[PDB]
A paper describes a structure:
The direct target of thalidomide and related IMiDs was identified as cereblon (CRBN), which was initially reported as the gene associated with inherited autosomal recessive mental retardation.
The (S)-enantiomers of 5HT and thalidomide are located on the interface between SALL4 ZF2 and the CRBN TBD with the same orientation. The glutarimide moiety is enveloped in the twisted β-sheet of the CRBN TBD and forms van der Waals contacts with three Trp residues (W380, W386, and W400). In the (S)-thalidomide-bound SALL4–CRBN complex, the phthalimide moiety moves farther from the neosubstrate-free state towards the endo direction to avoid steric hindrance caused by the β-hairpin loop in SALL4 ZF2 and the β3–β4 loop in the CRBN TBD, conformation of which seems to be fixed upon contact with SALL4 ZF2. In contrast, the KD values of (S)-thalidomide were almost the same toward the wild type (4.00 ± 0.36 μM) and H353A mutant (4.43 ± 0.16 μM) of the CRBN TBD.
Numbering used by the authors:
A (entry chain B): 409 to 432
B (entry chain A): 318 to 426
The structure:
Amino acid sequence: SFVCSVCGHRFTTKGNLKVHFHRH
Amino acid sequence: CTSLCCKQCQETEITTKNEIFSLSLCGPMAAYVNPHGYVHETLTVYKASNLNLIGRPSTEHSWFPGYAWTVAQCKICASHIGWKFTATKKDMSPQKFWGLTRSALLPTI
Ligand SMILES: O=C1CC[C@H](N2C(=O)c3ccccc3C2=O)C(=O)N1
Ligand SMILES: [Zn+2]
Ligand SMILES: [Zn+2]
């Protein structure tokens, strides 16, 4: 339920989203 | 070379320059705004290599009406590169293409 605001990539954990987001 | 590469990898080839085409009227590359304000200068190419698709296609906020998008990232570096666009009506031409973000590619466009 967690969507990257930059790319639209969807994640099932908030922690996954945080790591991915900060790679942008 | 002939090629556009993943910027992070530097030498992972994503597409070749002959694959660039004008889907829009503004040209092969234009700036688009995503639903959170982020600007992506998106280059349309018929074909891209070395990308992993994430999830399933979606029409929400599609910059190209009649096409749905699927997130695409480098198979080597997992960097975000762009999106695969797939037609939702059988008459769209083409039926698929890729939008690659300028900031993710080398050489620097
Ligand atoms: O055609 C496209 C490609 C996808 C792009 N996009 C995003 O970057 C994004 C981020 C978060 C939620 C939703 C989206 C979305 O649709 C966008 O806005 N339009
Ligand atoms: Zn992202
Ligand atoms: Zn890469």
